[PDB]
């Protein structure tokens, strides 16, 4: 980076400062210069001599200038081969040395300089300039005209065109051209009182208009309507005449594109965006750049799948798009987290574990292809059962990719000389990529830029080795430096940034994003540059360039000038500010004009009134009715007209009574699935609406702790093993081989704690467990036949166990199974032993009461299929547990208990910060966005009616 910066400095010195280099080559110092010269003068010298040792040509332009000028100065006749005449058009800035060379060259051949001069009279170092808008923004042109005037052998004729002040814009342009000042300061009291000194401004006049918007979206949306109005107003106007200039085109590109694309056919305006970053094939470039960083990468699964996203890299290993849907879940489930192999893990100085690496996952999938997981571990690795059929061929392709990813990640590590880096890019491209009609252009561009970098390096004869991190970071910077401006004047309206030395007259000139800080654009000098210490005339800087571009844009506008900027932030409703240029412009406008009828007002009041009349404050939203009121500010988009008119109807209540007829046969699984979640059942079963949320992303790192469904499944396996009195050590080895448990001793500690916690419940279950078999359920209730199967029906009763906390839903499921068992006819009690000594116990019941409660449940199911059954088994369960009294078999009424039950219901519904509440659910959000007390009362009533027998018969 230091070499690059110093090279840029020396290039600038060559162009602008030849005397310095002439002195430095001899070895002397320039007097009265910057402090950094002490280390810059020798280096430059040490460069010249260096390039003489290699034998390269000595000549550079700095020494060549004087010899070139002296040759033509003393030449008696014209040298052969020179062109007849030259034109210099559109260039308002040249270095003084180029002007000296062209002056010396003018003798033999004629040179015509076309200089767009905004002012008629001599305005460079006038013998502050007369006009304020010219003095402020004319630094770039003052030096140029001062240089042009100093030419000895120059014959110049002035060809100006007078401007008639019939408009505000034409008034400003005439003030600039005639080099006169119109603003009234108001020094005299007589001058300050009357406002007649200013110029009359027509109210209908709209040549110059300033517009305040909220967001860039709103800004472009207002610009589109204003352009449509300008086109409709003037028949002679055409789209190509309009130009739209932005501070940074890449920031406004998506908004410009969306706004100008959303227009309907009758309202369509053709547009063309210029100077936008050239992005011919983004994904191939990005994939290759990522491939170059292989040695440093940790090879997270998501990163490799991001490489496989590229269709070319997948086609190379014949991995189809459909196979990627499989390889996603395979990578996720097998346990691949990070690291390509054990060696890569050790290279990062982290302890080699042997699990959760691409090698581990690949071995797991291959073993699962060979051996079923039911067999067991082979080399402390559990085979992955999923990839078992012909589809497993995908593995062979994936394992073929990683192998390559291995080889290259070892090849690119070592530093190499430049000439050894030449075949790397081509080999990598042809190995990793299979080209196509579209990608070939990008691949050729990649090879061309890589070859150009290495060619410059070899031409400089760089001996020492170069790391890949250098060439990668050079190629990345070189690939995005390209810009595509070939559609500048194609015919549609031109969208493009403000570029210096491009000043073309247009009828309509629009400027966007004039916020303070965005424009002008600031690029500070390097800080050790000697030019910026003692500047001279002709030195170029970005600030002066932008300040002069703003003047060029004003001068080139022939009919209408449009200026916009963000006034208030849409997010925070803060206050932004316009650029200092826009501020000086509006100040001069308001100080030089007065609206009709304000003659009596003083200078400041009429100035503020004019400034408020020209500045337009647009609404924050498009559907604001102010847009559609009749006037000049009226919009053209009729899509937001019904919204502004407030003519839409509100969303009716989602709940609607639907017809339903109970069939003759209802499977027991249907009732169970319904009562698990009655609202979700109406959504999924009645009208078949399923709200499938997106699956979870692959975890970043290997399991450190276990929580949620992971530890729930582990506890379920462990419990089902302990109740069978099976060996737990086998299950521990199996889980450790699968990689689910944490590494090493922590896995054993977790397993021991879980073993104790599950052993308590296993002892409780074994105390009552008896050998039982399943049975068939054929039943009749309320003219409806129920057919089902009940598993594990032992002579004692229905025994169930789950490693979960005590919840009402499980009690409801057990109650349904218990009612089915009793009504079917049996002598037994139902038990459920949940974690932390949770117990749901139901004593036996007679056939009649069983059928009665089952008929009640079926009626509830029918009502649910008709309209959504508002029964929240958790919150309503809390309310009913608070209100109900088991001793008296009656629910309490006193208002204190009611308040306590409401508090309990709200706590269960909303939930704490740590645990999500019952209310946070996709199905409940659909029915209501916010819980109302009336809905609460309805929920309480229904939940009480349906859940009363559970708490009544629970013991």
């Amino acid at each position: 980076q230091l070499s690059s910066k110093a090279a840029d400095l020396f290039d600038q010195y060559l162009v602008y400062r030849p005397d310095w280099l002439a002195q430095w080559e001899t070895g002397h110092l320039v007097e009265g210069l910057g402090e950094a010269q002490a280390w810059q003068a020798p280096l430059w010298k040490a460069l010249v001599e260096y390039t003489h040792q290699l034998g390269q040509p000595r000549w550079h332009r700095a020494n060549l200038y004087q010899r070139f000028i002296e040759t033509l100065e003393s030449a008696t006749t014209c040298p052969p081969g020179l062109p007849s005449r030259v034109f210099i058009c559109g260039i308002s800035a040249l270095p003084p040395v180029y002007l000296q060379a062209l002056q010396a060259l003018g003798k033999h051949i004629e040179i015509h300089l076309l200089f767009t001069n905004p002012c008629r009279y001599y305005w460079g170092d006038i013998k502050d300039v007369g006009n304020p808008l010219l003095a402020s923004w004319g630094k770039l042109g003052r030096d140029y005209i001062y240089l042009l005037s100093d030419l000895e052998s120059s014959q110049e004729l002035d060809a100006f065109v007078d401007v008639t002040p019939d408009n505000l814009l034409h008034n400003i342009q005439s003030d600039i051209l005639e080099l006169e000042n119109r603003a009234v300061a108001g020094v005299n009291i007589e001058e300050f009182s009357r406002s007649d000194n200013k110029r009359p401004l027509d109210p209908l006049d709209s040549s110059i208009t300033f517009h305040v918007c909220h967001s860039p979206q709103r800004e472009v949306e207002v610009l589109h309507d204003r352009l449509l109005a300008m086109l409709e107003e003037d028949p002679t106007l055409t789209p190509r005449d309009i130009i739209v200039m932005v501070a940074d085109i890449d920031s406004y590109s998506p908004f410009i594109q969306a706004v100008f694309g959303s227009a309907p056919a009758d309202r369509y305006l053709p547009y063309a965006i210029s100077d936008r970053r050239a992005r011919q094939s983004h994904p191939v470039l990005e994939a290759f750049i990522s491939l170059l960083s292989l040695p440093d990468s940790r090879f997270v699964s998501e990163d490799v799948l991001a490489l496989l996203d590229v269709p070319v890299l997948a086609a190379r290993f014949d991995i189809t798009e459909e196979g990627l849907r499989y390889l996603r879940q395979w990578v996720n489930e097998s346990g691949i987290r990070w690291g390509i192999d054990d060696d890569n893990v050790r290279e990062l100085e982290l302890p080699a574990t042997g699990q959760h690496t691409w090698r581990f996952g690949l071995t797991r999938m291959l073993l699962g292809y060979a051996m079923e997981s039911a067999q067991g571990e082979w080399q402390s690795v559990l085979p992955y059962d999923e990839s078992s059929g012909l589809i497993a061929e995908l593995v062979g392709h994936l394992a073929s990719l990683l192998m390559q990813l291995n080889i290259w990640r070892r090849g690119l590590a070592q530093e190499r000389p430049l000439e050894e880096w030449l075949p790397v890019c081509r080999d990598m491209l042809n190995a990793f990529f299979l080209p196509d009609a579209e990608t070939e252009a990008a691949m050729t561009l990649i090879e061309q830029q890589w070859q150009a970098i290495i060619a410059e390096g070899l031409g400089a004869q760089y001996g020492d080795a170069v790391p890949l991190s250098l060439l990668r970071d050079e190629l990345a910077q070189r690939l995005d430096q390209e810009r595509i401006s070939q559609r500048f004047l194609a015919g549609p309206v031109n969208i493009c940034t403000l570029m210096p030395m491009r000043s073309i007259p247009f009828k309509v000139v629009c400027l966007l994003g004039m916020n303070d800080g965005v424009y002008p654009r600031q690029l500070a000098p390097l800080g050790f540059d000697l030019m910026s210490q003692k500047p001279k005339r002709g030195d170029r800087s970005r600030r002066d360039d932008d300040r002069y571009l703003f003047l060029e844009a004003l001068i080139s506008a022939q009919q209408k000038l449009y200026i916009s900027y963000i006034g208030r932030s849409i997010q925070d409703n803060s206050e932004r500010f316009p650029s200092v240029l826009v501020q000086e412009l509006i100040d001069y406008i308001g100080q030089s004009h007065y609206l009709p009828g304000d003659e009596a007002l003083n200078c400041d009041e009429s100035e503020a009134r004019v400034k408020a009349h020209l500045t337009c404050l647009h609404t924050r939203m498009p559907f604001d009715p102010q847009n559609y009121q009749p006037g000049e500010r009226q919009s053209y988009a009729r899509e937001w007209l019904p919204a502004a008119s407030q003519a839409g109807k509100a969303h009716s209540e989602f709940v609607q009574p639907l017809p339903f007829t109970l069939p003759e046969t209802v499977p027991l699984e249907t009732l169970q699935r319904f009562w698990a979640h009655p609202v979700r059942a109406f959504f999924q079963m009645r009208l078949q609406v399923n709200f499938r949320t997106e699956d979870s992303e692959i975890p970043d790192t290997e399991p450190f702790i276990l929580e949620g469904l992971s530890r729930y499944q582990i506890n379920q396996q462990l419990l089902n093993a302990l109740v069978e009195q099976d060996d737990a050590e086998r299950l521990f080895r199996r889980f450790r081989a699968a990689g689910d448990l944490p590494y090493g001793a922590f896995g054993e500690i977790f397993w021991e704690t879980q073993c104790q916690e599950m052993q308590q419940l296993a002892d409780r279950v074994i105390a009552c467990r008896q050998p039982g078999q399943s049975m068939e359920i054929d039943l009749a209730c309320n003219g409806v036949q129920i057919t089902g199967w009940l598993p594990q029906v032992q002579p004692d009763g229905l025994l169930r166990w789950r490693p979960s906390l005590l919840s009402v839903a499980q009690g409801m499921q057990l109650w349904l199974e218990h009612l089915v068992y009793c009504a079917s006819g049996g002598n037994g009690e139902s038990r459920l032993f949940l974690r932390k000594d949770g117990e749901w116990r139901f004593p036996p019941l007679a056939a009649e009461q069983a059928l009665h409660y089952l008929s009640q449940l079926i009626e509830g199911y029918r009502e649910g299929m008709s309209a959504p059954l508002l029964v929240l088994p958790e919150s309503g369960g809390a309310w009913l547990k608070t209100c109900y009294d088991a001793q008296n078999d009656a629910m309490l009424d006193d208002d204190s208990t009611l308040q306590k039950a409401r508090t309990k219901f709200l706590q269960a519904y909303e939930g704490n910060m740590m645990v999500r509440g019952e209310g946070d659910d996709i199905w409940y959000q659909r029915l209501w966005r916010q819980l109302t007390p009336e809905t609460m009362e309805a929920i309480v009533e229904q939940s009480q009616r349906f859940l009363l027998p559970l708490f009544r018969f629970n013991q």
């Binding site: 789209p239 190509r240 305006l269 053709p270 194609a490 015919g491 559609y628 919009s635 053209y636």
Partner: peptide, 26 residues
């Protein structure tokens, strides 16, 4: 109050363009 959006009497024209032989052939 009564609200009405404006309409466009004169349609903008995209006749003007810059093309090569390839565009004409297509």
């Amino acid at each position: 109050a009564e609200l009405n959006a404006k309409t466009l009497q004169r349609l903008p024209g995209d006749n003007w363009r810059v093309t090569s032989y390839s565009g004409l052939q297509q």
